[PDB]
Each structure stands twice: as C-alpha cells, then as structure tokens.
C-alpha cells in the first residue's frame, strides 16, 4: 500500500478498511491550560524586554499564549 492518506503523518491512529493500493482510497474508519481557552503564560511590576525595548505589565498569568504555542 502507498502511504498517501491525508491523515498520514498525524499523531492519531485510525482503523480503516481498504481494497486498493493507495491509502487515501480507504474508509474514514474510527480513532483507535487548553489551547483554545487562551492559555496564560503561567498555565503553559513585570517587565518584558526584547531587543532594545521594554514594556511593563504585571503578571505572567495575564499574558495569553495563542493556541498554547510559543513562536
């Protein structure tokens, strides 16, 4: 079988059925802070310095990390 399914390369494993040499021809099958709730820097006078500039906040639990992922 050619490993050309759209889900190939994901962490989730699906149990599907197939009768053809191409994996994408297979059935959908079945599978077998929170990133969306605006995770605070802590969940994942203050001063954030970057380059030659500094802003002043207050708490790290007041900084949202979009989708829980740092650049």
């Amino acid at each position: 079988e050619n490993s050309n399914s759209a889900s190939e390369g994901s962490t989730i494993n699906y149990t599907t059925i197939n009768y053809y040499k191409d994996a994408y021809a297979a059935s959908a099958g079945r599978q077998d802070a929170p990133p969306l709730k605006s995770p605070s820097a802590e969940a994942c006078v203050a001063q954030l310095t970057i380059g030659n500039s500094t802003i002043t906040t207050q708490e790290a639990a007041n900084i949202v990390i979009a989708y829980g992922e740092w650049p």
Partner: peptide, 8 residues
C-alpha cells in the same frame, strides 16, 4: 542594569 532593560 543595562542587561536588564536592553539586550546586551
């Protein structure tokens, strides 16, 4: 304190 408000 430079290395506190700017990158040094």
């Amino acid at each position: 304190s430079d290395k506190n408000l700017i990158e040094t």
